[PDB]
Design a binder for this molecule. Structure first.
Ligand SMILES: *[C@@H]1O[C@H](CO)[C@@H](O[C@@H]2O[C@H](CO)[C@@H](O)[C@H](O)[C@H]2NC(C)=O)[C@H](O)[C@H]1NC(C)=O
Ligand SMILES: *[C@@H]1O[C@H](CO)[C@@H](O[C@@H]2O[C@H](CO)[C@@H](O)[C@H](O)[C@H]2NC(C)=O)[C@H](O)[C@H]1NC(C)=O
Ligand SMILES: *[C@@H]1O[C@H](CO)[C@@H](O)[C@H](O)[C@H]1NC(C)=O
Ligand SMILES: *[C@@H]1O[C@H](CO)[C@@H](O)[C@H](O)[C@H]1NC(C)=O
Ligand SMILES: *[C@@H]1O[C@H](CO)[C@@H](O)[C@H](O)[C@H]1NC(C)=O
Ligand SMILES: *[C@@H]1O[C@H](CO)[C@@H](O)[C@H](O)[C@H]1NC(C)=O
Ligand SMILES: *[C@@H]1O[C@H](CO)[C@@H](O)[C@H](O)[C@H]1NC(C)=O
Ligand SMILES: *[C@@H]1O[C@H](CO)[C@@H](O)[C@H](O)[C@H]1NC(C)=O
Lengths: 368, 368
């Protein structure tokens, strides 16, 4: 497929949709190139803003990786909205900073904490100011939702701008997962850095020794089994248009830091939902003004939220989701797709019938 | 409770709702008494029409059998609609025909084929003409949905009148069911008639010999275990208001024919979705002008449809529903309630929060 070697822009214009790139600069210096799809490729050729956040080890191209009839972003554009695809520090086209290079350790010294605290506010302020729209619709997947949880429950002025928070495969805690991500709990920082170093996160061979990895190798392409996106989010591609795997592989992950994965293993080990542990009381103070990483109050997140979770989701496992839902003040909708796993929400051929359609509707009764 | 001995009308007026009875006469001579609830009991005391079809071995009273706050028909009336409860040939108050008696064999020589071809068109024509409304909203449960599938995919003029088809526990095929209805596959016509005869269908003892029946007897009332509705659709009454069981038992089944059950066992045996096999090429010609029962093209059913299916539904099993959904051109919504079985859709205490409320909303955005 021709899109295997196309960047986000080319992939979008390839299907005849409009594309715009903007540069957002975070408070702490990161420069993020965000893409915008201002209107449909004819369908609905001022308009309400809808922001899409990809998840863990993913890419902003997730929302654009298939046919225009089954990719959230394209269908949302044809439905009459102004689609903005969020880009996080570290991933492709977001690897620059005013004060340090991508080749430095300092550049990658971040986790989702920073994404919520800096990347989101900056990107949205930009979008509001550029569009003049006072509010927008937020759609997050996987880690994208957890960014929202943190942001929206600690940034009132930001939260006020979101009229509805659509969460696909939510993740606040990760204490009951069936994901290979658990194997990392067996690893201390000392070892973590010796295995993966600082900077960009690559699986290396850490996972070959695991059963699930031998089973994968047996069934699907080696290419798939040695890709961190799948290793941590599931190898199952039953509901995928297997003709486009090479496209997902060539675009994910877009750029994840070793620190971020370590923050998640910290969560796998504690089962809580809290900020990153910088290593010591002194270091945590220099970041949180406390000696202990603060916890994230999911019940202080009031934005009206709709949740869609999978029954076969190994990362955002039903059990964890189970503990989450009740804590959500103002949960306006919930649906559990039994045969759906973590990545089905983005790449499943029936994702429009199972999820997307519902969102389009739900949105066209608030802002539009 | 007092409703145990009340007819459909009395049950309705018992809660302070208006009631009207109308006589519909099918093309082939059957006389059906249909009930109408023209408005709420105070709530919304001209209005859009919503037709409700009960399912296999059920009763039109299903939509009225509980409290006014959890019975689809009542809530629909209070929501401002004109509710019509369909009655099928054979069941209570639909056991008369211009040319033969209920005591004859000919009277019961029917299956859902006839319900779709004759009962539905006639009842709806009448409703249209009476209310002046050119369109209506159709809500089917169990076999009620299958009637719709046939009707709406073969009767264009009829289909045009349905703006939205709400399907609860859909059933086009029945080849992967966990229902005792499978045991019938072990039976040939010769034996079927010797065991159940023609005319009305009674369980007789055919099912006592089965495990699920011993387990039921062990847990619930014998009354329940020897009632065809539950034997074929599930004995589980966890989500029910168990204080009203005696009401369900005294009203179901309203009247099912042995021929209808044989049509369903034919389906269990073939795994397909097709018309009734009258027994021989000659007999089939005299009914379909072919020698083989025609098949029902579910993909020819264009009415916008919304589907709600249960995770623990033994009859409308997830697997079968699984094969159906993809075939539906124009499926506008889908939700699978994991803990719901076949009859939960009508009698579950949280049916309003799980299904009804979304239907009311969904409707109040089309016609009303
Ligand atoms: C699954 O992926 C394939 C490959 O992208 C899709 O088929 C192609 O669709 C594009 C766009 O219409 C055409 O230009 C190509 O000619 C098609 N064939 C091939 C071999 O690429 C297919 O439509 C996708 N979806 C499904 C359900 O098959
Ligand atoms: C379950 O059914 C019982 C009986 O139908 C309900 O309780 C009755 O409710 C009606 C009206 O609400 C009263 O007139 C009766 O006095 C109540 N008790 C009895 C013994 O009849 C009960 O509310 C229903 N639902 C639930 C959840 O309890
Ligand atoms: C994609 O490639 C084109 C052509 O080489 C380039 O102009 C565009 O800027 C690229 N997209 C991004 C996000 O850099
Ligand atoms: C999108 O198009 C492909 C073929 O072009 C089709 O097979 C698929 O069902 C379509 N998906 C949707 C959601 O319409
Ligand atoms: C969390 O948020 C709720 C609601 O604002 C509040 O009652 C509670 O005290 C907060 N703090 C903690 C630690 O839970
Ligand atoms: C219910 O009973 C009443 C009084 O016995 C009767 O008038 C009414 O017609 C009955 N309802 C039906 C549907 O027959
Ligand atoms: C209906 O009313 C009864 C009390 O009569 C209550 O216990 C039940 O929970 C209510 N259900 C709904 C959906 O309102
Ligand atoms: C079934 O319906 C579809 C859509 O109307 C049609 O294309 C197909 O030829 C029909 N016939 C059969 C036998 O499937």
């Amino acid at each position: 497929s021709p899109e295997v070697t196309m960047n986000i822009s080319q992939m979008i214009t390839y299907w005849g949709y409009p594309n715009e790139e903007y540069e957002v600069v975070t408070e702490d210096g990161y420069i993020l190139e965000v893409n915008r799809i201002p209107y449909g490729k004819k369908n609905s050729g001022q308009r309400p803003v809808v922001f899409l956040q990809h998840g863990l080890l993913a890419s902003a191209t997730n929302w654009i990786s298939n046919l225009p009839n089954n990719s959230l972003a394209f269908i949302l554009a044809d439905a009459g909205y102004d689609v903005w695809l969020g880009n996080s520090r570290g991933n492709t086209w977001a690897r620059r900073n005013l004060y340090y290079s991508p080749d430095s350790v300092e550049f990658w010294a971040f986790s989702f904490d920073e994404m919520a605290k800096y990347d989101l506010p900056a990107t949205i302020d930009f979008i509001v100011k550029k569009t003049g729209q006072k509010q927008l619709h937020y759609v997050g997947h996987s880690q994208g939702t957890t960014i929202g949880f943190i942001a929206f429950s600690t940034n009132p002025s930001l939260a006020k701008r979101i009229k509805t928070f659509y969460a696909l495969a939510p993740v606040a805690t990760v204490k009951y997962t069936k994901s290979l991500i658990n194997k990392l709990r067996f690893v201390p920082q000392s070892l973590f850095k010796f295995i993966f170093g600082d900077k960009i996160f690559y699986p290396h061979n850490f996972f070959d020794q695991f059963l699930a990895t031998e089973v994968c190798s047996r069934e699907m392409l080696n290419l798939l089994c040695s890709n961190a996106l799948f290793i941590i989010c599931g190898f199952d591609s039953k509901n995928f248009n297997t003709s486009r795997l090479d496209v997902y592989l060539s675009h994910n992950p877009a750029g994840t830091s070793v620190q971020n994965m370590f923050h998640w293993t910290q969560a796998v080990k504690s089962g809580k939902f809290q900020a990153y542990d910088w290593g010591s009381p002194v270091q945590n103070r220099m970041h949180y003004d406390q000696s202990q990483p603060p916890y994230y109050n999911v019940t202080a997140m009031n934005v009206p939220i709709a949740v869609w979770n999978g029954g076969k989701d190994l990362l955002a496992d039903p059990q964890d989701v189970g503990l989450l839902l009740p804590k959500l003040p103002n949960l306006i909708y919930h649906k559990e797709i039994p045969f759906y796993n973590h990545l089905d929400f983005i790449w499943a051929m029936d994702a429009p019938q199972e999820v997307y359609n519902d969102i389009v509707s739900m949105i066209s009764e608030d802002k539009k």
